[PDB]
Amino acid sequence: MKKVIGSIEFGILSPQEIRKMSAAEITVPDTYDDDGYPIEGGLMDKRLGVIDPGLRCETCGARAGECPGHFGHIELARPVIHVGFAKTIHRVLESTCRECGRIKLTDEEIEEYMQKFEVMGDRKGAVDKLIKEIHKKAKERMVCPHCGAPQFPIKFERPTIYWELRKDEEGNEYKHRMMPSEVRDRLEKIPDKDLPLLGLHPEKSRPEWMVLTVLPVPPVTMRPSITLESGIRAEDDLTHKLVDIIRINNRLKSNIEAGAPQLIIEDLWDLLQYHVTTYINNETSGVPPAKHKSGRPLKTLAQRLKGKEGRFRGNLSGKRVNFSARTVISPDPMISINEVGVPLAVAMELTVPEKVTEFNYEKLKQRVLNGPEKYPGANYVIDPEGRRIRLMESNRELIAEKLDIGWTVERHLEDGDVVLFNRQPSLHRMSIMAHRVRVMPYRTFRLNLPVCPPYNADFDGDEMNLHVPQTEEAQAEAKILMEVQNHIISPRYGGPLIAGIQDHISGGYLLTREGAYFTRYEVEQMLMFAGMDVNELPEPDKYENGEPLWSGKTIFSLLLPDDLTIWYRNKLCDEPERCEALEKLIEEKLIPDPEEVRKLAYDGFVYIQNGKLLSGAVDKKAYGREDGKLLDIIVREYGVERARQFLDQVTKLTIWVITHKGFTTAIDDEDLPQEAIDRIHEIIREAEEKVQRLIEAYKRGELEPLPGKTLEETLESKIMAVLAEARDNAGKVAERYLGMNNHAVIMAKTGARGKILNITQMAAMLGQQSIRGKRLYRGYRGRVLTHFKPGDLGARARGFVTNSYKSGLTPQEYFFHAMGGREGLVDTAVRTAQSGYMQRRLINALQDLKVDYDGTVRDPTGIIVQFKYGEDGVDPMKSWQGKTVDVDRVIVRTLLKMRG
DNA sequence: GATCATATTGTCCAGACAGT
DNA sequence: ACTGTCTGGACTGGTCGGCGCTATGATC
RNA sequence: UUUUUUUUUUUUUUUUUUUUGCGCCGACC
Ligand SMILES: [Mg+2]
Numbered sequence: 001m002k003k004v005i006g007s008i009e010f011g012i013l014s015p016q017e018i019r020k021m022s023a024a025e026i027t028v029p030d031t032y033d034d035d036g037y038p039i040e041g042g043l044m045d046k047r048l049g050v051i052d053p054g055l056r057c058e059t060c061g062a063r064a065g066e067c068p069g070h071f072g073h074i075e076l077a078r079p080v081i082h083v084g085f086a087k088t089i090h091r092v093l094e095s096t097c098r099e100c101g102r103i104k105l106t107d108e109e110i111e112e113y114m115q116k117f118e119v120m121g122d123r124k125g126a127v128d129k130l131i132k133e134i135h136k137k138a139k140e141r142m143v144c145p146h147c148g149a150p151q152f153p154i155k156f157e158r159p160t161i162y163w164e165l166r167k168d169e170e171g172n173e174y175k176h177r178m179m180p181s182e183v184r185d186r187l188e189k190i191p192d193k194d195l196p197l198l199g200l201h202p203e204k205s206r207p208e209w210m211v212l213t214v215l216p217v218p219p220v221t222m223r224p225s226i227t228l229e230s231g232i233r234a235e236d237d238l239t240h241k242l243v244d245i246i247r248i249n250n251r252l253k254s255n256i257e258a259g260a261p262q263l264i265i266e267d268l269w270d271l272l273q274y275h276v277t278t279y280i281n282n283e284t285s286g287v288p289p290a291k292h293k294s295g296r297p298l299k300t301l302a303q304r305l306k307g308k309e310g311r312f313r314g315n316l317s318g319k320r321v322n323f324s325a326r327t328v329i330s331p332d333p334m335i336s337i338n339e340v341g342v343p344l345a346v347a348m349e350l351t352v353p354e355k356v357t358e359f360n361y362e363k364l365k366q367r368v369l370n371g372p373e374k375y376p377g378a379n380y381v382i383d384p385e386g387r388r389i390r391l392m393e394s395n396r397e398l399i400a401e402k403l404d405i406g407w408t409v410e411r412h413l414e415d416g417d418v419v420l421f422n423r424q425p426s427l428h429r430m431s432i433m434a435h436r437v438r439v440m441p442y443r444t445f446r447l448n449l450p451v452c453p454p455y456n457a458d459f460d461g462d463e464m465n466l467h468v469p470q471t472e473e474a475q476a477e478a479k480i481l482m483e484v485q486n487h488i489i490s491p492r493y494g495g496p497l498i499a500g501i502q503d504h505i506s507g508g509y510l511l512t513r514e515g516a517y518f519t520r521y522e523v524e525q526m527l528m529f530a531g532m533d534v535n536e537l538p539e540p541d542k543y544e545n546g547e548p549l550w551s552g553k554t555i556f557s558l559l560l561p562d563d564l565t566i567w568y569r570n571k572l573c574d575e576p577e578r579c580e581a582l583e584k585l586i587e588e589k590l591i592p593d594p595e596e597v598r599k600l601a602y603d604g605f606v607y608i609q610n611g612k613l614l615s616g617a618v619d620k621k622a623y624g625r626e627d628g629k630l631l632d633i634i635v636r637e638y639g640v641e642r643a644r645q646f647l648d649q650v651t652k653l654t655i656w657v658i659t660h661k662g663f664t665t666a667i668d669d670e671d672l673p674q675e676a677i678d679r680i681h682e683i684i685r686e687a688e689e690k691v692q693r694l695i696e697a698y699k700r701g702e703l704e705p706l707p708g709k710t711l712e713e714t715l716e717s718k719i720m721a722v723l724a725e726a727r728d729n730a731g732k733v734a735e736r737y738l739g740m741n742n743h744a745v746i747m748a749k750t751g752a753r754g755k756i757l758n759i760t761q762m763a764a765m766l767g768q769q770s771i772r773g774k775r776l777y778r779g780y781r782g783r784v785l786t787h788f789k790p791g792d793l794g795a796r797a798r799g800f801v802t803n804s805y806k807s808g809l810t811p812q813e814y815f816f817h818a819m820g821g822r823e824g825l826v827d828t829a830v831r832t833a834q835s836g837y838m839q840r841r842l843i844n845a846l847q848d849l850k851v852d853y854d855g856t857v858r859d860p861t862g863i864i865v866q867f868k869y870g871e872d873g874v875d876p877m878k879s880w881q882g883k884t885v886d887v888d889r890v891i892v893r894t895l896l897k898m899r900g
Numbered sequence: 901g902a903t904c905a906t907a908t909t910g911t912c913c914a915g916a917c918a919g920t
Numbered sequence: 921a922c923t924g925t926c927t928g929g930a931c932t933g934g935t936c937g938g939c940g941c942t943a944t945g946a947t948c
Numbered sequence: 949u950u951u952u953u954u955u956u957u958u959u960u961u962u963u964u965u966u967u968u969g970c971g972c973c974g975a976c977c
């Protein structure tokens with residue numbers, strides 16, 4: 001059968017294990033000869049694997065691409081210290097007797113630590129603290145309790161140098177260098193019983209194994225060799241490092257065999273130690289990194305695992321995948337929110353493997369007969385034996401007549417297929433959702449507009465990735481869990497995320513506003529466009545010139561369910577006295593007459609009774625993101641499919657309404673009368689006079705300092721407050737003369753796009769430009785620009801733009817606005833990286849937490865983090881405004897349903 | 901004029917550490 | 921027991937494409 | 949007129965079915 005990995009046990013490889021697992025001994029530094037054949041005994045020996053296609057492995061007998069590679073070994077002439085175990089070696093040497101070999105602890109202390117180790121074993125932090133305490137206790141001891149032999153302090157010098165402070169005959173203290181052979185001999189005397197006290201395992205990690213005597217050379221598959229376009233081989237950095245190691249080891253062995261003096265032996269030993277240390281880690285502190293001939297700092301085994309481009313993050317936690325596509329996205333309101341537009345070229349390339357069954361034999365046979373060049377067709381066919389056959393014109397008929405039950409047909413992407421649609425960066429779980437394939441002739445992806453806010457995607461050149469699941473389990477998981485309609489409500493705040501946007505909101509406002517009426521032709525056309533299942537028109541609301549007319553509220557009410565009742569205040573409510581009468585009428589009777597409601601109907605108060613929009617207008621509070629009460633109620637009380645249908649119908653209806661009525665903005669939308677401009681100029685002049693008076697008072701010393709601040713900050717705060725008040729007054733003056741008939745004002749007030757402040761800047765004035773919360777000061781001595789006098793603290797000299805976008809900015813005001821915009825762009829480009837790093841840290845901290853079947857949240861070890869998730873066991877996605885149950889809404893809905 | 905060994909050894913935050 | 925100092929580390933994801941670079945000195 | 953060496957049977961053919969890495973620069977979202 002098949003087996004899976006249950007657990008992984010780590011340790012230090014013994015020299016005997018390295019020798020036994022080795023397939024060959026490497027002694028020749030050279031890799032390839034002049035003819036290009038591998039050299040026997042070299043680093044590219046065929047016993048370690050094969051890279052070239054024509055080569056055959058002497059250990060496996062297989063060809064390139066399927067030989068896994070085999071490890072070698074190098075017999076070092078002298079032992080060397082592993083740089084990754086240097087601190088542990090120093091700690092163990094400090095914590096152990098030099099000649100006796102036992103740990104410098106009493107028997108009672110050893111027993112006490114042995115019993116304490118069993119109690120604290122689950123938490124690795126407790127074990128680390130116990131190890132540190134044992135090391136600290138054993139370090140201060142200068143006499144071994146087991147034998148009474150005197151001890152000397154051991155000094156550790158980076159990277160792998162150990163100094164022993166021995167005492168001379170006259171009492172002088174001199175440093176004695178401990179060679180790796182002496183260190184290994186000292187480590188060999190430690191018994192197995194003291195190893196748990198030192199944090200080592202008797203059978204897995206012996207202390208003497210931390211001093212390397214046999215170096216395992218990696219297989220050639222781990223360090224592949226390529227050839228360039230000019231025929232010159234490009235060896236890996238590990239290959240060059242191993243070449244240097246082999247050369248130095250051979251030179252050291254030859255010098256040892258030649259009886260060289262000890263001075264040469266120490267130099268060669270140090271060179272070999274440096275080479276081994278750089279091979280293990282080329283970024284070790286205090287070590288000059290190994291450099292290539294061209295000057296390139298080589299990357300080694302340590303660099304291949306850590307970092308963004310390491311083995312873990314770059315190849316294990318994340319990697320490139322097959323059956324994926326990426327292209328520019330384009331809007332498509334005609335498709336549903338559950339659908340994605342797939343190009344025909346993309347569909348004809350990406351394939352889904354479908355097994356031949358009894359109920360789909362004819363379809364797959366037709367797909368095979370069509371071939372790869374005829375849509376809908378197939379590209380590959382897999383027999384039950386498991387081999388893959390490519391489909392072409394010559395053999396498409398032979399395969400088609402040979403098709404049977406159990407075959408696999410890699411047909412092209414068809415309508416209704418489930419694929420993954422993703423936009424980067426993936427900040428939340430809504431960044432990847434499963435859509436339905438819709439095949440289109442052009443070369444762009446198509447995404448429905450309400451699905452843009454979950455992706456945070458616009459259409460100014462955005463590109464998105466498409467993934468096609470290949471297994472039945474993955475397809476089922478995508479279809480059940482990751483469908484678009486299943487994630488309308490955002491789990492972050494428990495509100496709508498897949499909601500209407502600017503044009504939908506504007507069209508809804510245009511349709512549902514007071515005085516909006518449509519002819520029979522317009523109503524029928526918008527009903528056909530929206531796909532609503534309406535066969536007969538309702539009774540006309542009024543007649544004009546002998547022609548029937550339908551109110552927009554009547555057309556909008558066809559979308560709502562017949563048993564839906566809700567009332568609230570939208571963003572268009574500017575006269576609360578009109579909403580108060582409606583609220584009192586609703587409260588008094590709880591079933592108000594529809595004629596009575598329409599008599600005192602107000603656009604700012606939306607009231608839906610039994611699915612009929614009796615009052616109010618559609619805005620961002622209707623079905624907008626994070627504010628749509630109607631959409632949120634529809635999701636919670638009618639399911640996700642009904643909500644998806646409602647969204648698909650209402651988006652098309654509002655799009656038709658806004659398209660044929662005519663929505664536009666012009667240069668006269670920001671126009672203001674002369675009296676408004678005069679008032680704005682008067683406000684600006686008054687603010688400038690106030691700033692000048694404050695400056696004069698500060699110069700005369702009459703300014704009262706604020707608590708906790710000196711005169712300069714007090715004056716700056718007063719000036720900024722005055723300028724902000726002036727900007728607010730100018731904005732109010734501009735808002736006074738901009739009525740509801742303005743399309744830009746409609747867009748700002750309905751929440752479709754933009755703000756009132758955006759219209760204020762173009763109409764009245766820009767205001768004060770500031771960076772880092774302070775007025776502009778960077779420039780010359782005492783002045784931002786030379787055009788102003790030195791020492792001028794006035795508003796105009798510090799970044800107060802009196803002009804507006806329509807009036808035209810002065811060059812100084814242009815420079816100030818450029819400073820502000822640069823500050824904003826820099827702030828965004830700096831904040832993004834910190835936010836991403838914090839998100840990665842949080843993800844890695846809370847990756848393993850999940851809710852068990854009993855409602856508890858536990859770590860993989862088993863420690864209970866929460867006895868109930870959220871202390872109430874309620875999903876934030878299904879929570880009503882952060883609460884457990886919306887009691888008032890339930891009571892009101894039940895009472896209305898039973899009394900209606 | 902062809903080949904062959906050899907080719908060098910950037911601020912900030914947090915934990916550990918001499919000094920008083 | 922505090923306090924300033926030395927040392928280690930990580931530096932948001934994806935995508936697009938381009939542009940170089942991967943021997944040399946001394947015999948026989 | 950003289951010592952201290954030993955001896956024997958069971959394993960077959962002329963040969964065979966797919967550019968990695970390094971660093972830089974610009975740019976999109
Ligand atoms: Mg964009």
Ligand SMILES: [Zn+2]
Nearest residue numbers: 049057060067
């Ligand atoms: Zn092999």
Ligand SMILES: [Zn+2]
Nearest residue numbers: 097100144147
């Ligand atoms: Zn001892």
